[PDB]
């Protein structure tokens, strides 16, 4: 169960980074002063957002850009909680055994 939930989350995270990159540019163009407006740097912004690093070099200023950002965040965080929970499950079993 756990590994499949984790693997799926990883696949789902990759999809969210790419879709999030596309949707962030769509949301932010048309807002004066917005910088999250070209796709290559938007993919970079989605990665530093999903990992929760959040340098501050780029960020959304619109309502829809910010909603996209929160989905990226939660997708990243969730994937990591799942990988962590999966590692714990693995270890717990190998330790029962040892």
């Amino acid at each position, epitope marked *: 169960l756990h590994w499949r939930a984790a693997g799926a989350a990883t696949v789902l995270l990759v999809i969210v980074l790419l879709a999030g990159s596309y949707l962030a540019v769509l949301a932010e*163009r048309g807002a004066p*002063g917005a910088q999250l*407006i070209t796709y290559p740097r938007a993919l970079w912004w989605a990665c530093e957002t999903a990992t929760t690093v959040x340098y501050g070099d780029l960020y959304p200023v619109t309502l829809w850009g910010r909603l996209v950002a929160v989905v990226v965040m939660v997708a990243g965080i969730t994937s990591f909680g799942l990988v962590t929970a999966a590692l714990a499950t693995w270890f717990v079993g190998r330790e029962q055994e040892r």
Partner: antibody
Framework: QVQLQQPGAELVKPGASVKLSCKAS????????IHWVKQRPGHGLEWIGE????????NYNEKIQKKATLTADKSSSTAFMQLSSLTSEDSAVYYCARERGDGYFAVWGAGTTVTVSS | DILLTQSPAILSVSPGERVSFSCRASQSIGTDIHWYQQRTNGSPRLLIK???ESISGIPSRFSGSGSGTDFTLSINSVESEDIANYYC?????????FGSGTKLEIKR
């Protein structure tokens, strides 16, 4: 082959409207945006607006009076700019240009010379 | 919105000389500047992207430099075909904007 094809000219009476076209060929991606640029004789390049065909959303220059409405047809790979209620101030060459979502205009159409006159 | 100032508006050089066009942004825009050449009755043509990156098909004669607010387009050894108007354009913040253009004149 020519990536963006535009008609050479359009004559428009003051107050009437006209719909300019820009037919695209070559590689097309979901990240493409088509932009329109206005250039009056002897003057510089003025950005009018952009549209992303894959989604149909358009943004416009807020600094100028809005004369344009952008649309795009996916099946005919054609982008359109509807100019309305024109005056002589609208007489100029209007170019369409393609941007691959990375900020620069890789290719430009030949431009449509629009003359507003009776 | 970002203002791009191109000055002087007219540059006159002698054949074969190195010339440089200036583009100054009203605020720092990284290297998000692109340059276009527009010959008389022609449409604009991209020459350099992201301040210094080459474009295939463009003579090696052209190059770009700078970052922040000050950018330069240089032509090593100008020749007649370089006669044209040159424009810079930024893509750092929405909306994209263009400089007012510099015309290259050759003194033969």
């Amino acid at each position: 082959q020519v990536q963006l094809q535009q008609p050479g000219a359009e004559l428009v009476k003051p107050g009437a409207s006209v719909k300019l076209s820009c037919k695209a060929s070559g590689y097309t991606f979901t990240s493409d945006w088509i932009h329109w640029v206005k250039q009056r004789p002897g003057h510089g390049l003025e950005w009018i607006g952009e549209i992303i065909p894959s989604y149909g959303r358009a943004n416009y220059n807020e600094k100028i009076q809005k004369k344009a409405t952008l649309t795009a047809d996916k099946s005919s790979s054609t982008a359109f700019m509807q100019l309305s209620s024109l005056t002589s101030e609208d007489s100029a060459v209007y170019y369409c240009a393609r941007e691959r979502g990375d900020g620069y205009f890789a290719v430009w159409g030949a431009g449509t010379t629009v003359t507003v006159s009776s | 919105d970002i203002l791009l100032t191109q000055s002087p508006a007219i540059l006159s050089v002698s054949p074969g000389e190195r010339v440089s066009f200036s583009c100054r942004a009203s605020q720092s825009i990284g290297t998000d500047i692109h340059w276009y050449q527009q010959r008389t009755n022609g449409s604009p043509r991209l020459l350099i992207k992201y301040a210094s990156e080459s474009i295939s098909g463009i003579p090696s004669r052209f190059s770009g430099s700078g970052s922040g607010t000050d950018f330069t387009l240089s032509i090593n050894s100008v020749e007649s075909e370089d006669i044209a108007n040159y424009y810079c354009q930024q893509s750092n913040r929405w909306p994209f904007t263009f400089g007012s253009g510099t015309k290259l004149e050759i003194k033969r």
